Amino acid sequence: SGFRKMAFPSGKVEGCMVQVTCGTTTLNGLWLDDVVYCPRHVICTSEDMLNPNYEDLLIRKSNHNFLVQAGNVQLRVIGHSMQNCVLKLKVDTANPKTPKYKFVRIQPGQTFSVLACYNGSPSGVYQCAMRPNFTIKGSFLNGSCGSVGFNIDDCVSFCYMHHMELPTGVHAGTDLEGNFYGPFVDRQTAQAAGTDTTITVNVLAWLYAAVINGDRWFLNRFTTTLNDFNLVAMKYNYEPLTQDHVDILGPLSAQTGIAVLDMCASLKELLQNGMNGRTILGSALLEDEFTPFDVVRQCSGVTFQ
Amino acid sequence: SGFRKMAFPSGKVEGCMVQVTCGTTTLNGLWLDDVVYCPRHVICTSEDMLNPNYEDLLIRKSNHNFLVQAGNVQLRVIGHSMQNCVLKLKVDTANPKTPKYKFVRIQPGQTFSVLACYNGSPSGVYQCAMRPNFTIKGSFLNGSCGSVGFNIDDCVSFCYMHHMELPTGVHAGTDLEGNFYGPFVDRQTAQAAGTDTTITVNVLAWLYAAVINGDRWFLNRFTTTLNDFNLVAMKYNYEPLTQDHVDILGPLSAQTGIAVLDMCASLKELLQNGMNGRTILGSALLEDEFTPFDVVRQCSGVTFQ
């Protein structure tokens, strides 16, 4: 029993982090077989980030100017390439700690784990969800660039590499192909993020976990339809709710005896009349970073390699 | 920038988890060199937990009835002993993955990371604090007994092994010597936990992180003394605040320019007049599971081996 925000076990990932240096800046890297992945702005000094031409700056760089330090042992860069916003730093010795990995581009509303690192060393792990506006709300300091977000399946799925922190404090990054989430670019200029809406489908799965774990005073008396719900949600800035969202909620509906539309009616009155200083699962706010799949994993305890 | 609840990297610990079977029950174990540690109630079936005599039941058990499965490879128990509430299952092959470990008994109000496991396999990691009443509020299912709580220094410090879940849903366990935290015993009877008071010193460190990270509307106009504060806290069920707590808050006071007693005055009005539907660091409640040391580790980004 109980419910916590669990991150995935970080052992496989923390064997792949390397220290990447190019000039004065030191950020992290992802060591896969014989290609080291790290943000391409490492070749950039502080003045460069303003209006940098990336194609020209790498030309002024050679194979002997990047230092890939794996703890004690140092690697020798043997070939470099730029994939959108990422450097593939090919090296000589292939990593024996390479796991079954995958490269995935997540969709908004999905959750993963982040191994925050500095100087190539692991410092912490926590769970976060991609916001609909393609940003995240983590804890990143200077030098934590190159920290990776992953999901463990017996396979690791890397889906995020932190690049920059917006002047609003929120964080932005790319996938392991080098393609940013959102409209962001890796230069130090005012880049606008949009309206951040609450993830409705994750909130409804969180309520089901609450019923499984006991907190159920919110089980209301009214019902509602699916247009009636989305009308209320768009006013409270909640994303519209689809039929595929209902199908994803199927197993939770079966286990608890509460129909998906009946739970929506409880949320509708929750939004309109608040929670009244009363908590659900130990929180005074509506949580939107538990996907429906996540609730099943924790309440049923599936494990991994 | 930003602030999250970070757990420690779980790689070192997840190389030490083993599957321990004795009869029908299957729970987890901690594989250190050549001694396997696991709860002593594994020798206990469902009827046994009611009124079990532990000294007699092990006598009816022999070296060939415990199965310590490390993933694929199986170990052969060669010697057994009982240390309070724990089985030391001595085996033949000494674990090559044994790290620099330590055995520590934490004090109430301190925080650590838990690697929740099932059948000897890691399923998640999250951060939790020991409550003053010597319980924890985690996510434990059946078979998650033997899951360990640790702190990483280049040394791991195991401090908790989950044993039982109280009928109130909260969790209880021992240290790696086998000594329970609190008045609890490993039998299935109604065991009473006391008044759970909020950890004041952790709350004050959380406010300092908020000021470092921006949320500061709570910086009040009044001041107060240290008896005046503790009088208000005991009414709101908050533990009394000591001088050693102030000394521990020293570095946070220096970095922010806010005196320790001045922050207490802000909390005093926070407790008396609420937060008014307004958030701090993204929460509508006062958080008491960030120790003062924890706030320094995240805002300054220290790493480990």
From Swiss-Prot, chains A, B:
Domain of life: Viruses
Linked residues for Glycyl lysine isopeptide (Lys-Gly) (interchain with G-Cter in ubiquitin): 5, 90
Catalysis performed (reactions): TSAVLQ-|-SGFRK-NH2 and SGVTFQ-|-GKFKK the two peptides corresponding to the two self-cleavage sites of the SARS 3C-like proteinase are the two most reactive peptide substrates. The enzyme exhibits a strong preference for substrates containing Gln at P1 position and Leu at P2 position
Every Peptidase C30 domain range: 1-305
Cytoplasmic topological domain residue ranges: 1-305
Outcome of mutating residue 90 to R: In strain: Beta/B.1.351
Localization per Swiss-Prot or TrEMBL: Host cytoplasm; Host Golgi apparatus; Host nucleus
Impact after mutating residue 49 to A: Does not affect ability to cleave and inactivate human TRMT1
Regulation: Inhibited by pyridone-containing alpha-ketoamides compounds 13a and 13b. In turn, alpha-ketoamide 13b (tert-butyl (1-((S)-1-(((S)-4-(benzylamino)-3,4-dioxo-1-((S)-2-oxopyrrolidin-3-yl)butan-2-yl)amino)-3-cyclopropyl-1-oxopropan-2-yl)-2-oxo-1,2-dihydropyridin-3-yl)carbamate) inhibits SARS-CoV-2 replication in human lung cells. Inhibited ex vivo by michael acceptor inhibitor N3. Inhibited ex vivo by compound 11a and 11b.
Active site: 41 (for 3cl-pro activity), 145 (for 3cl-pro activity)
Assembly description: 3CL-PRO exists as monomer and homodimer. Only the homodimer shows catalytic activity. Interacts with host FBXO22; this interaction promotes the proteasomal degradation of nsp5.
Job of this protein: Cleaves the C-terminus of replicase polyprotein at 11 sites. Recognizes substrates containing the core sequence [ILMVF]-Q-|-[SGACN]. Cleaves and inactivates human TRMT1, preventing tRNA guanine(26)-dimethylation of tRNAs. May cleave human NLRP1 in lung epithelial cells, thereby activating the NLRP1 inflammasome pathway. May cleave human GSDMD, triggering alternative GSDME-mediated epithelial cell death upon activation of the NLRP1 inflammasome, which may enhance the release interleukins 1B, 6, 16 and 18. Also able to bind an ADP-ribose-1''-phosphate (ADRP).
Protein name: 3C-like proteinase nsp5
UniProt source species: Severe acute respiratory syndrome coronavirus 2 (2019-nCoV)
Source species taxonomy: Viruses, Riboviria, Orthornavirae, Pisuviricota, Pisoniviricetes
